[PDB]
């Protein structure tokens, strides 16, 4: 996260760290959506241009964390994966369209002050909140510039689709949305390397619950002027999510 700030304790109790078992390291972000299911970017698990193809056994899920590097005894919980599901139309060759994956945990995780699932949007929540200028929040342990001690937070405004499309030569799809400040707006911030798979969340003003509207997917560089962060549109892929869970 570039140009964010340190999270408060318990501010993002759905934040999940995808952890590599050997060499022990951060792979990606992710989010908790129930006591047994974790949501992330498909590119976190499968990205052939970089010879990435992780299997269940290569990885661990670390839930309830704050510190990037420390073992947070009596607070985090470390879970093994039972199974990985990648969208069958995930487009790694072109533009990362449908950049989404689910992870089923071996055992349900215990909820706590620091561990709690986020909501997934229904159609009406999506329509209400996914509007240009409306701000969301993205969190991660990724790079601070194109390594944090603790989880970082940044609030960013949703950008108009033509502004998103005109910022890149990549083909943008209805399964993506972009966010970030324009150079003229003065403020800045973005996701970066290692923040992949983490959540873009919004707080509904109607029922006061947090919803995960996006997944950290791609950006040309990090926090570059005139470029934006691109996020997987979670509601657009909700049919696939539910079918998998069901």
């Amino acid at each position: 996260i570039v140009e964010g700030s340190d999270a408060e304790i318990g501010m993002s109790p759905w934040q999940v760290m995808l952890f590599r078992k050997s060499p022990q390291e951060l792979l990606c972000g992710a989010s908790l959506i129930s006591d047994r299911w974790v949501l992330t970017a498909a590119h976190c698990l499968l990205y052939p241009p970089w010879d990435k193809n992780f299997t269940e056994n290569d990885l661990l899920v670390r839930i309830g964390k704050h510190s990037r590097t420390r073992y947070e005894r009596n607070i985090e919980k470390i879970s093994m994966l039972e199974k990985i599901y990648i969208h069958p139309r995930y487009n790694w060759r072109e533009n990362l369209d449908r950049d989404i994956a689910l992870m089923k945990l071996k055992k349900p995780v215990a909820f706590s002050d620091y561990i709690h699932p986020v909501c997934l949007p229904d159609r009406e929540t999506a329509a209400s909140l996914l509007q240009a200028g409306y701000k969301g929040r993205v969190t991660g342990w990724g790079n601070l510039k194109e390594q944090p001690s603790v989880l970082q937070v940044v609030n960013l405004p949703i950008v108009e689709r033509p502004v998103c499309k005109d910022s890149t030569r990549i083909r943008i799809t209805d399964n993506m949305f972009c966010a970030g400040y324009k150079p003229d707006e003065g403020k800045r911030g973005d996701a970066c390397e290692g923040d992949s798979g983490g959540p873009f969340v919004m707080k509904s003003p109607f029922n006061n619950r947090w919803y995960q509207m996006g997944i950290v997917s791609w950006g040309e560089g990090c926090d570059r002027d005139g470029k934006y962060g691109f996020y997987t549109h979670v509601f657009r892929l909700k049919k696939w999510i539910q079918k998998v869970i069901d």
Partner: peptide, 10 residues
């Protein structure tokens, strides 16, 4: 690596 060691159990 820069990562404090996790319990062996995991």
């Amino acid at each position: 690596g820069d990562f404090e060691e996790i319990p062996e159990e995991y």
